[PDB]
Amino acid sequence: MSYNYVVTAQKPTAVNGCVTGHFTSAEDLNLLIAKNTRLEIYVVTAEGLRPVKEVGMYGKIAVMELFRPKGESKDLLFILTAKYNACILEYKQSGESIDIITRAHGNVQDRIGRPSETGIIGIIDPECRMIGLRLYDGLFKVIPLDRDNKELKAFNIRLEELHVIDVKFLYGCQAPTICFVYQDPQGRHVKTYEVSLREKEFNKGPWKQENVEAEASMVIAVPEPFGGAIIIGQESITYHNGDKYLAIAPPIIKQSTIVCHNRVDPNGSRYLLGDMEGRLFMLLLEKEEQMDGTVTLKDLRVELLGETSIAECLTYLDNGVVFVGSRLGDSQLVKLNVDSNEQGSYVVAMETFTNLGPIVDMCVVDLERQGQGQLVTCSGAFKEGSLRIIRNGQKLHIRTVPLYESPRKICYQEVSQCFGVLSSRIEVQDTSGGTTALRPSASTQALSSSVSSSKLFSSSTAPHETSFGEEVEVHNLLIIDQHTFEVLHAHQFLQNEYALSLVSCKLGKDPNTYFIVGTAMVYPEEAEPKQGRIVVFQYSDGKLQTVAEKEVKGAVYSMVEFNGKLLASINSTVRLYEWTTEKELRTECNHYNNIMALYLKTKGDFILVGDLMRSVLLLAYKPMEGNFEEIARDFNPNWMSAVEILDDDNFLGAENAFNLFVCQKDSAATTDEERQHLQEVGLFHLGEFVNVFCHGSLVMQNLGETSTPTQGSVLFGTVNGMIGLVTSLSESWYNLLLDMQNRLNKVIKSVGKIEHSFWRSFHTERKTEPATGFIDGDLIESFLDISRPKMQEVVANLQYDDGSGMKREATADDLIKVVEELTRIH
Amino acid sequence: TKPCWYWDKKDLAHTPSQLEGLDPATEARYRREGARFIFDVGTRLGLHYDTLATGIIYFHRFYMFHSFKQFPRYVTGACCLFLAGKVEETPKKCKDIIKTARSLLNDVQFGQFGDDPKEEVMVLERILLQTIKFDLQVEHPYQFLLKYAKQLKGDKNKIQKLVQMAWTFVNDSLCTTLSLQWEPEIIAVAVMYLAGRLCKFEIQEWTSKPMYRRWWEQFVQDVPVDVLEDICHQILDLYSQGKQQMPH
Amino acid sequence: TESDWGKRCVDKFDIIGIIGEGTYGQVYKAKDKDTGELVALKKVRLDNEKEGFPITAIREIKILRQLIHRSVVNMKEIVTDKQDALDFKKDKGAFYLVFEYMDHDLMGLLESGLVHFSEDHIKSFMKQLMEGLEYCHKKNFLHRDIKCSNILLNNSGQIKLADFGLARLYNSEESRPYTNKVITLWYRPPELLLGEERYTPAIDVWSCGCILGELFTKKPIFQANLELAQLELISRLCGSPCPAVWPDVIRLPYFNTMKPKKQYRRRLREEFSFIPSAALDLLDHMLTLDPSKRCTAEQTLQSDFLKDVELSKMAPPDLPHWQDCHE
């Protein structure tokens, strides 16, 4: 068996959702910002936001909604986790003591159901009579909000429309009414139903099924006086309220997909819209009041306000400050001014909240020779793309290097005192036949620049037609200085060439240090790429020189330096090249038993291979023979996002289902059958998507540094920004720390009353297994934050085992020291 | 695709056994003794008639590729029955087959099994499987005797006498190389033809084509009487050579 | 000739690597040097010599040389390890069963998050599987262990049944005692969970129905660790075994001993309301408690769901090969 320890160095920074309401007091205005597994509670001030409370939940926060049922003084909060843990929460403050009350809770998972394409949707009735949940295709789940439903018991109503895009409860209806957009073979339609708690079924809805734009994406329930709903698409915004039909199709929105909506004026007169290129719009509902006193919607109007960060969620503070929550970029507070500035913008940034954003890749490098080590991350996307320099100093110090284009891979080349970074920027087919970039960015603002002139694929004769307005990716290699982070050089790859892998190394007997990039020729027609290049560059005297190129018949997803040789993953093939005295790559040997060799790592002559579906395979290079040999494969099938080698016998992997697993050599060599069976000894639900595993530590290592029982340092990055460390433990330390977890879980009160053991259990749509081989560091490091009575309750009956150790009895004060020693690693 | 398992009578003059100086009468004797050994051992163990026949067919086929002078017959037989049990899902442990073989064989005969009977038998399985070319599925005259008899309609007692007499002729033919000369379907017809002649029955009357004097042609296409006569003649030879007579 | 099996050497094939571990021996992927064909070799070892050549392999050789259908995996030949010569007694080498190589397995494809199967994809999938089962069933052979690991897929969309190691002939006129535990618990039929000693061909149909539902949910229908818990899950959906729906349930040995929490009512149509109507009837018929009332393989092919599916217009399964690499 294997024993490992996982700890969170930096918490998730990406904003997954945000709401404003009256949650902490019926009087204050609150902004609840939700990051993965983390809930932040703020109070709105005239200056900004005042933080008041932050809690963690044992689950990914999927639905977050504020409502106030009749009889309550203040808003209550509903949160549903991605594992279908539902709960209703209340804020309670006793002077200085702030705690969160679990008013109702339960798991709403169905034994049978098909998870929907557009994900979990949660909405609440305006009269707070019920909570609507869209979890599975063809089913609508109703949790009625009666006082007695402390377990959140619920029922399902059959739904004929299998493919639902979005749904909202409508205002101004005689009965609870849902308005949704659905997709069948005839296109997309908007339909309504009424929801009967007494009959537990749908009844005919108040208004007709208009068929709507093919890409209708979001549903807005408009309050009285207008009532009805607004439907947002790619080209048009339409308002439906029974007989009323309105359609505005301003050309400005066709340019970039709109992804978020928020109400400004409680009466529905004004709404905010944001799109993927960062534009912030105002949607105005023009009012006309007829003689009879009735208010009708005269027209819909759209006005461009300015630019924000690509917003995942939008929320308006009544002071006229709008919070921009971004998963792809830094979140913000912006001000909407009545008068435009001299550039024509009504939006001026107030504060910027750092978001590590998508961490596509990272490298650990000691720039200052302090020995501490810094973490340089490829962070953000599109106009939010950046590099982040991260070092310990008690908080993390983070420098931001804007790129305004997407970074993909980063590697450090010390000989050149610079980094190599792969990046891509979006250009659009323009009337010249070429393309035009939407904005300048790192690859265009380089001091010196070059473009591949390779003739490898120039024979073409394969037609690829271009339509004006279509997007393309343009890929570049950036040479960035390690002190100034100035873009010294930018090399632009071939048209339709995607740069997928990058290394910096010396090869063979060649003293020169090179940048080597692996690329693939990506054409929309090809399901799998069938062409690619391995390009050897040299950065010398402020210019990048193309040293050599090797054509491959596939995509070079990953490359790694291997004992002076170059290891490559070309689609199914895994290849080892040699660097000749003629400065050309020469193939030594191949391996073909892979569906796709997406991820590669090496130690000594051993190679770890990560496959799209075939989990991990341990290869070996056999120098006596000049070829590879399959040592062992994990036969259980898992989808890989990243892999790492812990030691010669233990291998760490990450699943696309937000799970972490460790595989070991069976080390019971009685039969060749056993040697070849890597056995999954560790299972842990991280709750995050791991893109990159990197050996190293940010701790300030010095001659004689405080040492810990944990051995090794593997750091990982996630899509939501979380940075974490995986480390090894001895059997004795695991057992101690695990036995302590079980004791802590009985003592510590969970928000929503979610069992910790459930949260960390391995979970795919098909499987759920109890966690094994992993210690949740955050639970262990929460021992130092529980009250003294609870600490002593935890240490009752604590004994040491297996001899060669200390006195079995342990006190609260002894453990406080052990945990603090463990907090040194992060 | 599939191997051919049938030789011409003339070809049996050139088995390995013959070419190592064994005369025709001796190889015939060896085949009867080996087959009857397989039959007797399995009957003592309670084995289904198909399991006995399958072992016997493996045995007969085996000695078309090997010589009786280099492979002791009773070891081969025991190995065939052992494998036949696994093929026909009537399995037996090798130690039980040896136990029964010892009960039935004298001291000289059991000498063939050498010092370690079980290993000598178990070892041969590798050769046996390669020799029969891993073609384990075998059909036997029994199933055709019943399939064809079921289509006869008439005196219940005359047809049952025909079947049992023919059934006995099938059991007796396992001691011969007919298993190697003619498909089982033909054997089933031949024994019906013979039992009929001896019982003075006219089988065509029981068929759906009572004026079709060659009654068998509706069961087995393309079989001349000469083929049927040869098979019948060979079966009765065993009775005349022995002291035993036709069952009737 | 092509028919002289067991003689050719394993040398003719170059072993690419071990793809899976089989019950009797591990399976390796390989290439024929002569033809370049990719084959999968199942290692059969008589070296243990506890009771000679394994019967699991004997069944698979005996049956798969008889069964020729597109939806049944073909054993191409049997090869041997370079064996000792002149020492037939000393020979302890192994035998390899050559099969066509299939790129993926159904469980592995579903375990990958987004292998999305549309209605027409499932029609092509189930039609082939049931045609193969119909072929095997018309030949009176019962493939007892039907699971997602045993259904194999080629990118062409060809579906093939594979592990016949637990297959035995069934006679309707002559009942014989049979092994009590014949299918994997998740896909096991109710009569075998109540201890049916004389299994029917319908036990296989129940399994294929579990798969039918699984292809619409991407999750197995009856997941349990213990035989009683499995009967409870089946009962929650299909109804509790009761004489009114299964008159001969009383004759099964464990009926009195093994009771569900309640005498549940059948909800199969309610919990599977999202399934197309043509398919729901298929699921309802295949997941019938009484094996004598459960539809046969032929009847499934004569259904509104599979009757008019044309295998000529094969629909390839979802090919997410490039977007999934770089999400």
Ligand SMILES: CC[C@H](CO)Nc1nc(Nc2ccc(-c3ccccn3)cc2)c2ncn(C(C)C)c2n1
């Ligand atoms: C009796 C079913 C049992 C299931 O484990 N064995 C088995 N599984 C096969 N599928 C398979 C599994 C993994 C890989 C793989 C692994 C790594 C990289 C790339 N591909 C490829 C194919 C298979 N394909 C042909 N055969 C014949 C022997 C019938 C097979 N037998």
